[PDB]
Structure formats: structure tokens, C-alpha cells
């Protein structure tokens, strides 16, 4: 019951998956060999691992994940890595030639020869799950594989599994830092897929994580490893409600309807607090109100998008640890009284509170410190129009005279696809502006 299938598209998706999977193994007490020690103190076994792990008659736990990537380096290195025994030898699909940061290549030429096998693996994952809650797809649309193959995979999931919940944790391009010149092209081309066949999309820009870890952890040079640790922490906080009992347990579809006001509006920011180093973890009193204020602080956010430029439409607060339904209520009331953040007029309540009794775990060798309580955000707000207004402006700047478009044309994509995605993003501007407009 409550099984969730994890999909990792692209290199960024694969590494985020590695981080979240070591976090899941740490939480559920699973060694890299795939086994779970017998809890002799209690005498009967947990079923919390069922949502992410499938039991084998030999007692080994197989993760419910599919690593789909068009180039073999990362997946082969995982096969050589520590969790080789843990991970299924299949469902770890390797392509032969990379998409080369081409949405057209990942969606029209190399996508078809691997999407059939990817869907076969997805079916072998789903038919095992008798209570499949939904799919969580970790990817970065900035690249070629994560954009094109991700869009194709979303197409097939939407057309074959009906209205199953989909959670697209997408790493969008940041305002200044980016590792590609065609990255805005890939992003704007993939916005159509992430708008049509993505039930809830979560923003995972890189500069926000970079500066958050720089100033909060007091660490000069953390890396992709640390940002993936934060992403795994966020996803674990989101998904812990159905794994560990709490005062208020919210499932994926439980908070999906509270998050999404309109079908076209499902792009959400996220944040996490306290993201605190060990040195100053034991000096501050990290109360529920304190961590809620830290979450609502625009700086303390995992997405680089200032909410004060927009208005909150629906906030979901996932608390873990020794929080109490009245401390969360008091924090909510005090912050409603506080005025520097604006809530949209047609959503008076605008707040969802989930509570879990499981304090967040700490990855050995990581940067997060042992804290008694924490809280994560899934916030749907009108401020997200800003990042789209940056990305489509960049796309127009490069598309005024067709930079890097011969590569897409030669891969079987019509020239009109770019324009189509352009007015798709324009409509995604207009609907957000309309819902943010006062009645």
C-alpha cells in the first residue's frame, strides 16, 4: 500500500535519485547489500519500507526506482558503486549515445528507441505495486535527455496510466548560473510537457540551493553532492507522511487538491528549515515558530524567486519531529497577522499543515545537523511567473535570429515547435497573471 515509483531522468535526475535513495536507506535502516536487520527489540517488522522498497523471499529490499539516462557513464558508475547490490540490475537503463543537450534529439530521434524499454520497466515496477500512489520524476529540463526523454516519458505515462499522480521535481535554469547555452531552449520546449502531463511540478533551481548552503551551513565550497542532499531531504520530508504516522498525515492526492487551484497552475516553490550547521545548531532554540518564520523568509528558500513580488495562493507546510498541532497553529496565526507576505484574496485559509513524528535523519558525512524538528514547504504562488518571464525572455533573445536551431531542425523537429512552445509559455504567463489579479 501507498507505493510510490521513483523515476530519475538525465544525469541530474540520476544523481538526485542517488542522494534521495541513500537517504531512504538511512531512514529505513537498509544496508547497501539490500538487507534490513531484524528489529529484535520489537520482534515484528516495519512496513514503512513498502512505499519505496519491495521485499524478496530472500529478505532483500529492492528500490522502486527507474534510472533512465541516454548515456552510459553515470549508470555504469552506479553499477560499479557502493549500492550495486542494492539497486536492481535492470530498471537502471543505459543508453548508448547521449542526447547532447538537444530536446529534439531526446524527443524525436533517440527517445523512441529507448522509451519502449523504459515503459516496459515502468510496467514491471507498477504491476508489482498493488497500491501505487503515483510517480515522482526527478529531472532537469535544462539538459537534453531530461527535457526530451522526460517529455516523451510523461506523454506515455499520461496516455497509459490515466490520472495517476505525478510529481515532477524539475531543476530549472537559475537567473545567472547555467551550464549550457541551449538550456533556455530546452526549458522552453519542455514547459509544454511539464504543463500538460505533470500533476505537480516542483522548482529546484541551483543558485538558491548554492547560496542557502553557503550562508546557512557556513561551508565555502559544497557541490552537486550537497545540493542533491538538500533535494533528497526535501523529498523525504514531503513523502514521510505516508511512511511514518503523524498527528496530521497527508498523502500525495491529499495535498495535491489543496495545492493546485486550477489545472494549469501546478508549479510550486519549496524551502526547508532549519537547514543549520552543527556548530550553531545547539545554540539556537529552533522552535516551531522559529522554523516557520525561517521557511517563510524569502532568503531561506530552495527556489530563487522572491515571493514578495507575487502573492501566495496555497502553502503546504510539512513538519517533522516534536512539533505540536497548536505550535503550528500559533505560528500560522502570528504570520497571518504579520503583513510582509501577501495571500491572494480568493484563498482565505490558504494553509495546509501536515505533521509527522519522525525527526529528519542525518546523512553521515553530510552537512545537515541533528535537529529535533524541521519543516518543508510546497508553496503555489503567483511569484513563479518571474522565472518563466526570465526564461522566455532568454529564449526570445536567442530565437530572434535562430541561434542553435539547426541542431534541433536536423533531429526531426519542425521550426514551428519553438514558436508553439513560445505561446505556450506566454499563456502560462497570462493565466498566472489572471489568477493573481484581484477580483
Amino acid at each position: 500500500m501507498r507505493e510510490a515509483i521513483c523515476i530519475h531522468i538525465g544525469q541530474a535526475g540520476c544523481q538526485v535519485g542517488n542522494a534521495c535513495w541513500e537517504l531512504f536507506c538511512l531512514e529505513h535502516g537498509i544496508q547497501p547489500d539490500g538487507s534490513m536487520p531484524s528489529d529484535k527489540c520489537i520482534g515484528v517488522e516495519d512496513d514503512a519500507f513498502n512505499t519505496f522498497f519491495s521485499e524478496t523471499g530472500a529478505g532483500k529490499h529492492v528500490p522502486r526506482c527507474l534510472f533512465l539516462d541516454l548515456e552510459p557513464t553515470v549508470v555504469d558508475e552506479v553499477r560499479t558503486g557502493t549500492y550495486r547490490q542494492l539497486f536492481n540490475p535492470e530498471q537502471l537503463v543505459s543508453g548508448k549515445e547521449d542526447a547532447a543537450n538537444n530536446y529534439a534529439r531526446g524527443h524525436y530521434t533517440i527517445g523512441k528507441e529507448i522509451v519502449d524499454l523504459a515503459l516496459d520497466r515502468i510496467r514491471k515496477l507498477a504491476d508489482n505495486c498493488t497500491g501505487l500512489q503515483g510517480f515522482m520524476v526527478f529531472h532537469a529540463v535544462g539538459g537534453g535527455t531530461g527535457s526530451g526523454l522526460g517529455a516523451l516519458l510523461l506523454e506515455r505515462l499520461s496516455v497509459d496510466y490515466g490520472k495517476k499522480s505525478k510529481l515532477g521535481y524539475t531543476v530549472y535554469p537559475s537567473p545567472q548560473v547555467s551550464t549550457a547555452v541551449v538550456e533556455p531552449y530546452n526549458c522552453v520546449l519542455s514547459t509544454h510537457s511539464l504543463l500538460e502531463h505533470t500533476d505537480v511540478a516542483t522548482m529546484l533551481d541551483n543558485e538558491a540551493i548554492y547560496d542557502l548552503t553557503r550562508r546557512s551551513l557556513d561551508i565555502e565550497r559544497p557541490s552537486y553532492t550537497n545540493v542533491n542532499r538538500l533535494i533528497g531531504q526535501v523529498v523525504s520530508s514531503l513523502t514521510a507522511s505516508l511512511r511514518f504516522d503523524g498527528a496530521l498525515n497527508v498523502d500525495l492526492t491529499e495535498f495535491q487538491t489543496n495545492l493546485v487551484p486550477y489545472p494549469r497552475i501546478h508549479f510550486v516553490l519549496t524551502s526547508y528549515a532549519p537547514v543549520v550547521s552543527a556548530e550553531k545548531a545547539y545554540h539556537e532554540q529552533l522552535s516551531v515558530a522559529d522554523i516557520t518564520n525561517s521557511v517563510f523568509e524569502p532568503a531561506g528558500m530552495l527556489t530563487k524567486c522572491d515571493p514578495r513580488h507575487g502573492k501566495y495562493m496555497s502553502c503546504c507546510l510539512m513538519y517533522r519531529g516534536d512539533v505540536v498541532p497548536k505550535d503550528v497553529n500559533a505560528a500560522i496565526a502570528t504570520i497571518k497577522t504579520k503583513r510582509t507576505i501577501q495571500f491572494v484574496d480568493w484563498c482565505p485559509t490558504g494553509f495546509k499543515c501536515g505533521i509527522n513524528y519522525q525527526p529528519p535523519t542525518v546523512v553521515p558525512g553530510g552537512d545537515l545537523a541533528k535537529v529535533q524538528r524541521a519543516v518543508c514547504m510546497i508553496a503555489n504562488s503567483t511569484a513563479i511567473a518571474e522565472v518563466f518571464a526570465r526564461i522566455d525572455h532568454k529564449f526570445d533573445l536567442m530565437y530572434s535570429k535562430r541561434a542553435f536551431v539547426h541542431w534541433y531542425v536536423g533531429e526531426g523537429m519542425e521550426e514551428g515547435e519553438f514558436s508553439e512552445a513560445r505561446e505556450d509559455l506566454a499563456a502560462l504567463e497570462k493565466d498566472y497573471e489572471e489568477v493573481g489579479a484581484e477580483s
Binding site: 531484524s38 529484535k40 520489537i42 520482534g43 515484528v44
Partner: protein
């Protein structure tokens, strides 16, 4: 501590919390139960001819798990059939009152079996039905080991490969009869009046079910530690038409005061 806020009210709340409570009692009860179960018992030795005897405490040991048959007095069930006390196999060092058992004769013989001699009145013979009773000190009522038919609601405590064996005070009954036989089913046709030797490896059958006692070495964690599942049913490596070939070590037993299986 600091008197900020409702310190007086918190102090009264705490004080009346301990007053109403007045954990430690549960731990003391657990330790008392362990001591009562593990109170050592003296089992009779082998005397004169090495034949097993009746009305004497003994240790029943399996040849596969190397453990001894034990019963945990708590963790019971009250079914319409009566009391249901779970029994298992445990690795024991000394003959504790928890894991020791006594054999007593049963009422009805084979009706084909021979009249046992006067001198061998106190000696258990092959195929002679007997009840397995817990020793006096475990509990002031007698507990009898008996199995029952495998039904939709009847099976081993965790697995379902074998039947449900248990200790219950419903003795002097058809279900409570257990008969003894040698290690070879082929040789258990001519030795039926002969006395059973103690030192040899041996096998237990339940009369009603015609199934041998066995333990799968499947660990379930009981309040005394990690016990091995115990049940009834013939286990064979090959699921042939008739089975009954080389008996699996699950079904082999031993009733020696001195010596242990490997």
C-alpha cells in the same frame, strides 16, 4: 526551573502525573517471569538398560535446530477449544523448568500392539502413545503438548508449512496422544513392542494427525528471545508421490539427559 509562564500549573500537572502513576512494575514482572521459567530442573539420568522411562523429567532436543522443546507460559489465546499456549524450540544450556518435559502413558494402544511385559511396565515402547506434560514447577496445572488438524484458521504461528502444535491443559484426550518411532519409517514396522533406547536419534508422531513433530528453524521473536517455529508435518527434500524416504532433520528428535545433538 525558570518561573516564566505557568510554572506553578506545570509543576502541579507533573506532580499529579506521578501521583496518578503511583514501567518499573512491568520490568519487575518480566524479570520475575524469566526467573520462574528458567528456574533449573533436575532431569533423570539413564539407568541400567539404556531405555527411556516414564514419569521422569527429560529434555526433548531436535536434531536440526539443536534446540530443545520449550513453552512460554504467557502469550496465550482463549479459543472455544480451550487455552492455547504457544510452544517452540529454544537453544538452552541447562534443563530449565521452561524447556523440560515428562512422558506419561496414554489410554488406548494400537489394538494390534502386544501386551507390554510386567518388567517393562515403566519403559516406553515404540509406537506406544504418550502425553507430554510440563513439569510441576512451571505451573500448578498440567500442560499437555498436542497438535490439531490444519484448517483455514489453523497453521504455524508465522509460516503455514506445518500444523499448529501447542501446550494446553486439555489432557487425557485423543488429540494429546503422541507416539514414538525410530528414525527409519521402513524399520518402524517390526520394532513396535521393543523398548526405545535413549541414546539413539528418534522421532515423534501425533496420533490423530499421523504427522511427525518438526521445527523449520524459522526464527520468530518471542518474549524470551528468538524461538524456532515448531509444528507437525512430514518434510522431505523432494515432493515425491509418497515421500517418507530419508527423513529430514526437522522430524528427528532425542530424549537424552546426557549429551547433545552436535
Amino acid at each position: 526551573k525558570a518561573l516564566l509562564g505557568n510554572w506553578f500549573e506545570e509543576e502541579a500537572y507533573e506532580r499529579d502525573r506521578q501521583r496518578l502513576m503511583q514501567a518499573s512494575a512491568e520490568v519487575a514482572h518480566m524479570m520475575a517471569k524469566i526467573r520462574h521459567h528458567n528456574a533449573p530442573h533436575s532431569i533423570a539420568p539413564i539407568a541400567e538398560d539404556g531405555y527411556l522411562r516414564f514419569y521422569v523429567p527429560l529434555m526433548l532436543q531436535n536434531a536440526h535446530t539443536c534446540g530443545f522443546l520449550s513453552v512460554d507460559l504467557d502469550d496465550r489465546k482463549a479459543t472455544p477449544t480451550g487455552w492455547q499456549v504457544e510452544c517452540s524450540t529454544a537453544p538452552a544450556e541447562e534443563a530449565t523448568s521452561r524447556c523440560t518435559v515428562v512422558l506419561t502413558p496414554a489410554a488406548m494402544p494400537q489394538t494390534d500392539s502386544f501386551p507390554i511385559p510386567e518388567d517393562e511396565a515403566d519403559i516406553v515402547h515404540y509406537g506406544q502413545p504418550f502425553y507430554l506434560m510440563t513439569v510441576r514447577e512451571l505451573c500448578e496445572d498440567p500442560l499437555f503438548l498436542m497438535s490439531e488438524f490444519i484448517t483455514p484458521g489453523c497453521a504455524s504461528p508465522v509460516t503455514q508449512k506445518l500444523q499448529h502444535t501447542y501446550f494446553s491443559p486439555d489432557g487425557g484426550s485423543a488429540e494429546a496422544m503422541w507416539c514414538i518411532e525410530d528414525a527409519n519409517p521402513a524399520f518402524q514396522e517390526d520394532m513396535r513392542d521393543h523398548p526405545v533406547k535413549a541414546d539413539d536419534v528418534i522421532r515423534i508422531r501425533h496420533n490423530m494427525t499421523a504427522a511427525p513433530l518438526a521445527s523449520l528453524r524459522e526464527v520468530f521473536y518471542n518474549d524470551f528471545g528468538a524461538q524456532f517455529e515448531l509444528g507437525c508435518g512430514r518434510l522431505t527434500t523432494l515432493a515425491t508421490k509418497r515421500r517418507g524416504g530419508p527423513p529430514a532433520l526437522e522430524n528427528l528428535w532425542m530424549f537424552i539427559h546426557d549429551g547433545q545433538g552436535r
